[PDB]
A paper describes a structure:
The mycobacterial repressor, [name], a TetR family regulator (TFR), was the first transcription regulator shown to bind c-di-AMP. Recently, [name], a 201 residue, TFR regulator of a putative MDR transporter, Ms5347, in Mycobacteria was discovered and represents the focus of this work. The [name] N-terminal domain consists of helices 1-3 and the dimer domain is comprised of helices α4-α9. In [name], dimerization is mediated by helices α8 and α9, which interact with α8´ and α9´ (where the prime indicates the other subunit in the dimer) to form a four-helix bundle dimerization module.
The M. baixiangningiae [name] structure was solved by selenomethionine single wavelength anomalous diffraction (SAD) and refined to final Rwork/Rfree values of 18.5%/20.2% to 1.6 Å. By contrast, electron density with an unusual spirocyclic-like structure was found in the ligand-binding pocket of the M. baixiangningiae [name] structure near residues 108-138. In addition to Arg135, there are numerous [name] residues that contact the ligand, including Met66, His94, Asn97, His105, Val108, His109, Tyr138, Leu168 and Asn172. By contrast, the HTH distance observed in the M. baixiangningiae [name] is significantly larger, 50 Å, indicative of an induced state. First, the shift of residues in the loop towards the dimer interface leads to a pendulum-like movement of the DNA binding domain as a unit, which leads to the large increase in the distance between DNA binding domains. Second, the structural changes in residues 117-122 prevent the formation of the cross contacts between the central subunits of the dimers in the DNA bound state, which we demonstrated is essential for the dimer-of-dimer binding mechanism.
Residue numbers in the entry:
A (entry chain A), B (entry chain A): 10 to 205
The structure:
């Protein structure tokens, strides 16, 4: 799991300073290993950045997908998926920030062409994740557990809203897992159940 | 309204290229006036950026505040305010992007100290706007038109969600005002009424 520890540290370093100003030294500092070991596993700073994005998307899919196939109505499955999405965002916040840095710099003139192409290619992971939510929203409309709404718009809205927790959420030293689930549950109650 | 036209164009230019790579020439191109006229009204690119942020916040407050004091329950007023917020976002999208660029670069090491201080000072406009929504959410809980929830968390969530329309929304050449209100209304129905 040396590679995984490097990615964990890189996620936090990129979140702190952004891709441009983050350096390998910053990451070697965060992970507490040498530049030599980092370069054994990775070719460049940008290679680490892409790997963080990919791993972040892997981790959230692996956490959320089981809830999409468990027994439940569309509403029940959507609620469980959404709570899992937010628990992942809150507990793997650096990975979340790096995914969205990647999306933002997908067209950065500061990058080489191959680098923009690599970030654009990762959009497919995000699109496939969104398809999973859109299917469940469609199913919840069909089983009557969700209000009849535009499936695509509901999907884009829900995912934008879940991710928008990143506007105000920050990690807290002593915050417990049970407490992160409570907070995630409070937000999802508002997103799915509404304010009215 | 020469000054207003410059701000309109600057908002669109900053939205297109960001603060760093936007230039006065870009703005003079967008507005279709000379650099001389722009410098008559403004001292620098950063001065224009601050003015766009301020004007964006002025415009949204002036549109939304009347709905906060019209007759209605907390739910009714919150719905009207939220629709107005989204109509403003969709119709004044460049101003919205500049406000959030300002918030993001509030701590940019690329800026002089005075520039970060000026952007931090503008946070007060955003805080005062949020207070108006938090009051109405509290009132809707008190009049029973909204579900009992944490007022602060509901406020941060709702505003984050309304703004998160910017993830997917783009201006469309022939999009009508009546159609923008319809789309805004569809989103707000989901935000306030929920998906369930
Ligand atoms: N929060 C994520 C992991 O950190 C990153 O952003 B997102 O947004 C919706 C996309 O469909 C998948 O990518 O959800 C997972
Ligand atoms: N969309 C705005 C105007 O463009 C910009 O962002 B915001 O977010 C919530 C803040 O309380 C006020 O600032 O709402 C208004």
């Amino acid at each position: 799991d040396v590679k995984g520890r490097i990615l964990d540290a890189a996620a936090d370093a990129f979140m702190a300073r952004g891709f441009a100003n983050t350096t390998i030294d910053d990451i070697a500092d965060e992970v507490g290993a040498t530049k030599g070991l980092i370069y054994y596993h990775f070719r460049s700073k940008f290679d680490i950045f892409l790997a963080v994005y990919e791993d972040g998307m892997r981790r959230v899919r692996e956490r959320v997908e089981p809830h999409s196939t468990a027994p439940g109505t569309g509403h029940q499955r959507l609620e469980a998926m959404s709570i899992a999405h937010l628990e992942n965002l809150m507990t793997e916040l650096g990975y979340h920030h790096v995914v969205h840095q990647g999306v933002r710099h997908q067209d950065s003139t500061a990058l080489k062409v191959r680098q923009r192409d690599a970030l654009t290619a990762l959009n497919e992971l995000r699109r496939d994740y969104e398809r999973m939510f859109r299917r469940v929203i469609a199913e919840g409309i069909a089983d009557g557990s969700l209000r009849r709404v535009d499936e695509a718009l509901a999907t884009r809205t829900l995912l934008s809203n879940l991710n928008a927790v990143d506007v105000w959420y920050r990690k807290i030293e002593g915050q417990t897992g049970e407490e992160i689930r409570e907070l995630a549950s409070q937000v999802v109650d508002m997103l799915i159940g509404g304010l009215a």
